[PDB]
Amino acid sequence: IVGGRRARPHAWPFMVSLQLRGGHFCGATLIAPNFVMSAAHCVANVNVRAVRVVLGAHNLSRREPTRQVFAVQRIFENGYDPVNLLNDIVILQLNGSATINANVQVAQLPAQGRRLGNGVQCLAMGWGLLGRNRGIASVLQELNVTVVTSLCRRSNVCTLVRGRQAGVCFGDSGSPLVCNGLIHGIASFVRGGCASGLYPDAFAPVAQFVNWIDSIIQ
Ligand SMILES: CC(=O)C1=C(C)N(c2cccc(C(F)(F)F)c2)C(=O)N(CC(=O)O)[C@@H]1c1ccc(C#N)cc1
Ligand SMILES: *[C@@H]1O[C@H](CO[C@@H]2O[C@@H](C)[C@@H](O)[C@@H](O)[C@@H]2O)[C@@H](O)[C@H](O)[C@H]1NC(C)=O
Ligand SMILES: *[C@@H]1O[C@H](CO[C@@H]2O[C@@H](C)[C@@H](O)[C@@H](O)[C@@H]2O)[C@@H](O)[C@H](O)[C@H]1NC(C)=O
């Protein structure tokens, strides 16, 4: 997250870090005790058997007893189309069930087909890069963003920070966009580099996928 701020610790207990050899590479969202959802581009080409699913995290550079770690049992995809930047969602079934507590909670999803109007206020978040060269992030970041339809296709929810350069960045891939208390987005792609101040950030439109999601998690 570029130009965002540190989250209060465990403010977003559905927020997940996906990791390889102890290094974060992508965000995800706990949507049931034994399922997370993330971006399909996070796991394309990745050794899924080596992926660790980290719940209850805040500061990645610190040892944290609030943490629970799972492996991926199964992957569910929904037509990921990287050429057209479409259907950028996967569900990873875990090898066990999360222990739901103060630091680890299941996110709430919108109704199928819910649309977001121009001007909707959302929070993006993640452990992605902090700038062009500021560094990647230890502490979970969040960011106020506004839903926009200009320079956005119907097949995305897009957001733009007004009046300054800020936005999601590398490593924020697969992280939730929260709007009106619900996970409306999964960070999918940027244009013009991170925080261009021109192109909106694009997210997989979770509302479009809810019937598919419910079929899997129930
Ligand atoms: C392949 C790859 O690694 C990409 C990353 C990481 N991000 C990217 C970069 C910074 C932030 C984010 C975030 F997800 F957070 F929005 C994403 C991009 O933008 N990309 C587009 C490209 O490289 O052409 C890639 C991409 C390609 C296809 C889809 C689809 N559908 C999604 C992303
Ligand atoms: C689920 O997996 C947990 C962590 O497994 C570890 O990470 C994966 C990616 C592999 O590299 C593996 O060798 C590691 O042990 C376990 O700690 C946990 O017990 C598992 N739960 C089960 C089997 O129900
Ligand atoms: C910045 O964001 C704050 C928190 O956002 C609210 O709660 C999150 C979890 C989402 O549900 C989001 O849709 C809500 O807006 C807001 O309280 C605050 O007012 C925002 N400030 C500005 C100026 O945008």
Numbering used by the authors: 16 to 36, 38 to 63, 63A, 63B, 63C, 64 to 90, 92 to 148, 150 to 166, ...
Reproduce, without paraphrasing, sentences from the article in which this PDB structure was first reported:
Human neutrophil elastase (HNE; EC 3.4.21.37) is a member of the chymotrypsin-like family of serine proteases and is stored in the azurophil granules in the neutrophil cytoplasm. This highly active protease is able to break down mechanically important structures of the body’s own cellular matrix (e.g., proteins such as elastin and collagen), as well as proteins foreign to the body (e.g., outer cell wall proteins of Gram-negative bacteria). Thus, human neutrophil elastase plays a pivotal role in tissue remodeling processes, as well as in the onset of inflammation and in host defense (innate immune response). An imbalance in elastase activity might contribute to the onset and progression of many inflammatory diseases with an impact on organ tissue integrity, especially in cardiopulmonary diseases, such as chronic obstructive pulmonary disease (COPD), bronchiectasis (BE), pulmonary arterial hypertension (PAH), and pulmonary fibrosis.
Ligand–protein co-crystallization experiments and modeling were applied to design better HNE binders within our 1,4-dihydropyrimidinone series: X-ray crystallography showed the anticipated folding structure for HNE, typical for chymotrypsin-like serine proteases. Either potentially anionic or cationic compounds, such as carboxylic acids 16 and 19, or amines 21 and 24, inhibited HNE with good to excellent potency. Upon binding, the equatorial C2 carbonyl moiety of ligand 19 formed a strong hydrogen bond to Val216. More significantly, binding of the inhibitor 19 was driven by its shape complementarity with the binding subsites of HNE. The clamp-like ligand 19 fits perfectly into the S1 and S2 subsites of HNE, with both phenyl moieties perpendicularly directed away from the central core. In particular, the hydrophobic S1 subsite was fully occupied by the southern meta-(trifluoromethyl)phenyl moiety of ligand 19. In contrast, the S2 subsite found in the apo structure of HNE was at best a shallow groove, clearly not providing sufficient room for binding of the northern para-cyanophenyl moiety; however, in the ligand-bound structure, Leu99B had been moved toward the bulk solvent, thus expanding the lipophilic S2 to a larger subsite, ideally suited to accommodate the large northern cyanophenyl residue. In our complete series of co-crystallization structures we observed an induced-fit binding mode. All bound inhibitors from the dihydropyrimidinone series were characterized by rotational dihedral angles of the northern cyanophenyl moiety of ∼90°–135° with a preference of dihedral angles of ∼110° (mean: 111.6°).
